[PDB]
């Protein structure tokens, strides 16, 4: 597989960093999700599915 | 004028997911929209969303977002074109809900067109069937329906049959081969509390010809391409016939 | 939201006779009404843009009127084609919005239903099972009720209800009722009768039948 | 001249539910017209301009309508923070007006007024003067009249009146009045009477208190 | 996003002058109007009069045409207007009736940036209010209240206070110096025919209470300096306090 960073942790560009649609939950850290993945070829493929669909409110 | 055409009709497994494909031509206008309606048998009409097939840029309704994705086809066109003008266009219907089974439409919408703007649907699609559930390809229980002990002459009584438990609709039938044509009512459809079909099929006559005439009829199904013919005479705990 | 209404439900009337239909919305679209005509077996067909504006090649008998929060469809004199599904429609916001559909239906004189009833056959109770038929036939207009009274008790946890529309020659509904179980529970009853009210028959209605014959 | 007329000269209703405010325009404004509301000690702050825009600072707590002469607001619920004064205005002519305003009553169980008398004291009549203080405590609603009597002789001339507003956590309003004599006519009658009509009393109450208790 | 800022209240006698001024801050926009609108408590609320203070350009109601005088600054109006824009404008209220005692409003007008049209209000100050009267420069009268139906004991739940023969409106009330803030009840003002206030306060205490505690109330007001205090215990046809 293709790599993620968090710091503390390492993870496929193919499994949710932390959870579904991360910027409605924790916005401000979020934020710092792309300073971690920052500039790798993986992630912004699975920004695809990890800013994307209808969690249990939210609809995009 | 115009026309739209759309993929047949398609039955499927829940959680599953399912792809429907429009084309459009003929038109003299070039950059309208094409946009999705859907429809649960007569209980609402649905306006889903829609792409411009020339921007993409799908547009939904706030409904239908993460449970539907909306497509379209760009093509070798030229700047100049020369032809009638076309166009193609999808919804992938995906994580399927049983409440998912309704017909969906495609038409044309010229909000673009019109100063973008919103728009009426200007021209449709024929419509197409989606079924949602988790049922086998039963083919039916197809049994005679028996009349009841009989009122006697003097008026009209009861004549009829029944057709039971399968899957897909799509059923026929047809009393002596078409030669009774007036008279028969065939009720359309039931849907028997977990899945299955139901229908019956009925001849209002005076009283004169139970026992006597050759009442017959076809019944037609599309799973493993079944076909049944039968009669109907009174047999229950007893027997009368022809 | 914007909330639509059309305010018959149905509406029946004789060929020849004004339809008009109604449509209410709960703050004002201010034109940017559409009015759609839909045929069973079919997908529907525009009639109207705007508030009054025909659509291509729609003939004249079909007029739109309203403006702010109240429309309505008019048509001249209704042609034994027009009888058909009505829609209004709504697009001056971003959830374009269809109304709930009205019938329209052609009136004619009165008639009442004849009440059918039949026994299971062999091949149900060969595989454990008995089948029993109701039916009301030919009649208008169809705002009846109906139950299956099985030794003047209501069945109902079994049995499931079907309509017909107006035949297009005869212009008349009819129904059809099942109950169904197991052959051994068919046994515990001797009178199965069905009932129906209606508005053309003078009080209720009811045929009976018994198991065994 | 464009005369704004809101039907409602006050309003009530509990908190979480929806008021439904409107105003009469005495002549067509073709929308061009806006809704405020204030508070006692603030200016205006805008909430709607045309039939349906919101200000950029508003929540989904306000919604318009009207496209002529006929106006409404609809609050999708009060907040214990929305009762407030609220206004339409025109900007259709020359002359802008205001309506003469909308104030909302927060609802709540009534109580009953202790309607009270209060005698005067020699720190006024000192100084040529005496006045005496019929004082309605705790009540709701402030829909409470009080009228004064001397030798059961009406009083209605000098008598005049103050409200609260909406008072405490709970709009627990009260009334205080002053009839105010000379110090001659104070001394020559004898009974001090003051008569209170009220939704939470039964029927009216009369208090009273004699000269030299 | 914006503030309008205007000159504090006044007060007046019949036959004088007031220059009222206010400023505006921190917009994006350049071109807006500045509008004065007055209510008196007693009425609705009206709109005066306006400039554009780039043009200046005055514009009036036919109510306060020649009444009122509205002018403005030159607002360091200059190309590369990069600092942020503000402007100031004033109006001239002359020989005013003491039925131009009112709340006087300065709010932002968008009607010239809107295409040249009327509008409604955008922004507002918090006003200022003036005051016209023949009065002059007094503080209050006070006096203690006798229970009603004087028992102390028990039958009566307040204990109050009234003030009388001010000038400027803000005195002030508190309960045995502020400390019996609860329980508290008061009542806003009334300008008698004599020209002069006058307010009435309590606290909603049983007549047990008297001498159980000591009970009073201190004022403070702004002319001349004033300050004063009394006991509200029982005091006037006869000394039996508890």
Same mark, same amino acid.
């Given at each position: ?60 | ?126 419509? &197409?069937?989606?079924?949602? =559930?988790? %049922?086998? /390809?039963? *083919?039916?229980?197809? $049994? @005679?329906?028996?009349?009841? +002990? ?21 059923? &026929?039938?047809?009393?002596? =081969?078409? %030669?009774? /044509?007036? *008279?028969?009512?065939? $009720? @359309?459809?039931?849907?028997? +509390? ?49 | ?5 059309q305010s018959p439900a149905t509406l029946s009337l004789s060929p020849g006779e004004r339809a008009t239909l109604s449509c ?11 009015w759609?005509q839909?045929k ?7 009639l109207i ?9 729609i003939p004249d008998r079909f007029s739109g009127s ?6 309505t469809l008019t048509i001249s004199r209704l042609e034994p084609e027009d009888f058909a599904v009505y ?14 559909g009205t019938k329209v239906e052609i009136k004619r004189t009165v ?29 208008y207009p169809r ?22 529309e107006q035949?297009s020659?005869?212009s008349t ?41």
């Amino acid at each position: 597989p293709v790599m993620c960073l968090l710091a503390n942790t390492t993870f496929p560009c193919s499994q949710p960093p932390c959870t579904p649609c991360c910027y409605e939950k924790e916005p401000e850290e979020t934020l710092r999700m792309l300073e971690d993945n920052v500039m790798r070829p993986g992630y912004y493929q699975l920004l695809q599915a990890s800013l994307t669909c209808s969690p249990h409110r939210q609809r995009r | 004028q115009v026309q739209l055409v759309q993929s047949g009709a398609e039955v499927k497994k829940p959680g599953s997911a399912v792809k429907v494909s429009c084309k459009a031509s003929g038109g003299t206008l070039r950059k309208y929209a094409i946009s999705w309606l859907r429809q649960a048998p007569g209980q609402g009409l649905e306006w889903m969303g829609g792409i411009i097939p020339i921007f993409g840029t799908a547009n939904y309704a706030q409904k239908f977002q993460g449970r539907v994705t909306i497509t379209a086809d760009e093509s070798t066109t030229t700047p100049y074109t020369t032809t009638p003008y076309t166009s193609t266009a999808y919804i992938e219907l995906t994580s399927l809900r049983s409440e998912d089974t309704a017909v969906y439409y495609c038409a044309r919408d010229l909000g673009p067109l019109t100063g973008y703007s919103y728009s009426y649907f200007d021209y449709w699609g024929q419509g &197409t069937l989606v079924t949602v =559930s988790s %049922a086998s /390809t039963k *083919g039916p229980s197809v $049994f @005679p329906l028996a009349p009841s +002990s009989k009122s006697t002459s003097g008026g009209t009584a009861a004549l009829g049959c029944l057709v039971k438990d399968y899957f897909p609709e799509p059923v &026929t039938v047809s009393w002596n =081969s078409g %030669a009774l /044509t007036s *008279g028969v009512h065939t $009720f @359309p459809a039931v849907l028997q +509390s977990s899945g299955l079909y139901s229908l019956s099929s009925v001849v209002t006559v005076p009283s004169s010809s139970l026992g006597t005439q050759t009442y017959i009829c076809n019944v037609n199904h599309k799973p493993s391409n079944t076909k049944v013919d039968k009669k109907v005479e009174p047999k229950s705990c007893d027997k009368t016939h022809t | 939201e914007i909330v639509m209404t059309q305010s018959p439900a149905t509406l029946s009337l004789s060929p020849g006779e004004r339809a008009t239909l109604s449509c209410r919305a709960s703050q004002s679209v201010s034109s940017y009404l559409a009015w759609y005509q839909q045929k069973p077996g079919q997908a529907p067909r525009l009639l109207i843009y705007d508030a009054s504006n025909r659509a291509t090649g729609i003939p004249d008998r079909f007029s739109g009127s309203g403006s702010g929060t109240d429309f309505t469809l008019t048509i001249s004199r209704l042609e034994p084609e027009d009888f058909a599904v009505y829609y209004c429609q709504q697009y001056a916001n971003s959830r374009r919005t269809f109304g709930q559909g009205t019938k329209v239906e052609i009136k004619r004189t009165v008639a009442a239903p004849s009440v059918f009833i039949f026994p299971p056959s062999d091949e149900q109770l060969k595989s454990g099972t008995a089948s029993v038929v109701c039916l009301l036939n030919n009649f208008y207009p169809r705002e009846a009720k109906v139950q299956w009274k099985v030794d003047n008790a209501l069945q109902s946890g079994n049995s499931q209800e079907s309509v017909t529309e107006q035949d297009s020659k005869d212009s008349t509904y009819s129904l059809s009722s099942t109950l169904t179980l197991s052959k051994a529970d068919y046994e515990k009853h001797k009178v199965y009768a069905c009932e129906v009210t209606h508005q053309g028959l003078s009080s209720p209605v009811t045929k009976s039948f018994n198991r065994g014959e």
